[PDB]
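Lecture 7, part 2: worked example. A protein chain together with nickel (II) ion.
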Amino acid sequence: AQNPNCNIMIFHPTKEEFNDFDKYIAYMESQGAHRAGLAKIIPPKEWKARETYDNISEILIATPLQQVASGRAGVFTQYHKKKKAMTVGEYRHLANSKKYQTPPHQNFEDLERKYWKNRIYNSPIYGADISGSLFDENTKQWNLGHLGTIQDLLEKECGVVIEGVNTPYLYFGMWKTTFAWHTEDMDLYSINYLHLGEPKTWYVVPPEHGQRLERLARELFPGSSRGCGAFLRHKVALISPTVLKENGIPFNRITQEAGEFMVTFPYGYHAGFNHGFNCAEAINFATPRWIDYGKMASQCSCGEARVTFSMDAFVRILQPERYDLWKRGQD
Ligand SMILES: O=C(O)CNC(=O)C(=O)O
Ligand SMILES: [Mg+2]
Ligand code: NI
Ligand SMILES: [Zn+2]
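Predicted complex, written out as structure tokens:
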């Protein structure tokens, strides 16, 4: 068995290997990459996403989100308070202000210590989930706006044509902006490109151990667990590496820098934080190997998780028994 310890693997494809996206994902899996739940891909030196980032300041962040924490430093939830619209130039100036800017630090490990010590005492503002793309239309390789769609994958594997579309999303971050513990909708893959700015630190649980994280989460968030049998779908809970180690949960960590891709694999729980002002692009995708994960994915039916239009058909075709209850949650 390849990668039996479930370590995060790092890949360096050549320009020739960067042509065929599907084939390269399947290669990474032949080497055991999926067992970690997360992989890093460093693009060939010949490649670029676009020519410059000098002209992005007029993008609008219609609903910036203030991430307010509750709990203790290592075990907390966050709620998202909606703020007034602002441009990316306005948001960058806010990120760099004395109130929000990255503190002085020695290295990534010192900044990680500071994050876990102090995150709950501040409320950073995140521009999340903004439909759009920063890839140039002439970038042919690993262009996250030109991937094969999940609807086409389902149709190719299973024969059923379905409605829905699959487009990328932009994220503008600042120091301490946080992504809570989650798997993707319908336990899909994700791919994330860090276009510019400061790093993003990731934590991940191997897919084969995801239920260990769920059992810990039920113990640490007992009211939330009573409210919903899949409350991590709400994407609000944080648990620190120190707490995971104290409870014997297998995990790994890695820092993504500008110019690098990360892939998350089906049922790979992940969480993390941004080091300073940055911009990332991400999209969900599928392969043949995903179908069985999609058929088994948990679902939130309490009404909190509220998701995209295109998840309807995935539940309807892959999980017809659960469809009626899930849809009640959506209405
Ligand atoms: O970058 C972020 O805030 C969150 N991204 C992801 O969870 C992802 O790409 O799957
Ligand atoms: Mg602009
Ligand atoms: Ni994710
Ligand atoms: Zn729920």
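The longest strand covers residues 189-197. The chain is about 25% helix and 25% strand. Keep this in mind for problem set question 3.
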